[PDB]
Subunit: 108 residues, 3 copies
């Protein structure tokens, strides 16, 4: 990927009713945590949700594929996935940084 | 300089602007042929100022027209008009088809 | 290292933290002269059960990043599981809407 980076944010803008399917699919590949927020596409709007996950470079393709598995319906309006370089990941609780900081360690 | 660092094929143009200027920005962007803007409610400084984040991912060569157009739609002249951020995007994937890169952009 | 990869003039510091720590993080940043933090509500899905968090975003110069990280931790840390994470992403440029000022003038 260009830019090259140790970590990447995978940002998926998908249908709100596909949250659980994407989340469950990610869990199967060891991605235990996703961050979700409400967004609107074009007072007429289309409701979407942004799903954000930060992973190591070697996990990006698996994450993309897994999100598609959960989010795809075959109908126009399935959304888009963006990949952005992440220079650093820090765990607030411990100050751990990098690989020691990327995994989600919240309660299930 | 248009040669943004880091170099990337795509960039996210992220604008934090006044909530009431969103239709104006969207319309202005439509006038230059750009669609697919995503909008979300954010807040700046339990007292807050309501703002809207508008996000559009485009090719490197579209960035300057997008910046100019957002300003055109969002500027009022008063303090609090907001800011625009440009961030490198390594790839774009259309969920429906699996198309990647330029095919997936619009 | 402070020499972040990718190398960039600016970086977005993105903190996903406990909602009740907003005021402490904002105050702490103010104490080091940092203003212009933007916040939004997010849901940690990782019945439709979730954890409420707030995403705090600030775009700063490369040389402000370490102070910003440390200050956010100071404001947001409780020591208990669930304090959240900070992400750092390169930002190629900042533009002020009112003036059209770019680069450091805008940031």
């Amino acid at each position: 990927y260009i830019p090259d980076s140790k970590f990447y944010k995978v940002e998926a803008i998908v249908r709100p009713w596909r949250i659980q399917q994407v989340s469950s699919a990610l869990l199967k590949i060891g991605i235990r945590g996703v961050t979700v927020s409400d967004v609107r596409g074009f007072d007429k709007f289309v409701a979407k949700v942004k799903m954000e996950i930060v992973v190591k470079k070697d996990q990006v393709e698996s994450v993309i594929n897994t999100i598609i598995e959960g989010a795809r319906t075959g109908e126009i309006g399935d959304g888009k996935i963006f990949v952005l370089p992440v220079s650093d990941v820090i765990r607030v609780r411990t100050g751990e940084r990098g690989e020691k900081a990327e995994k989600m360690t919240g309660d299930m």
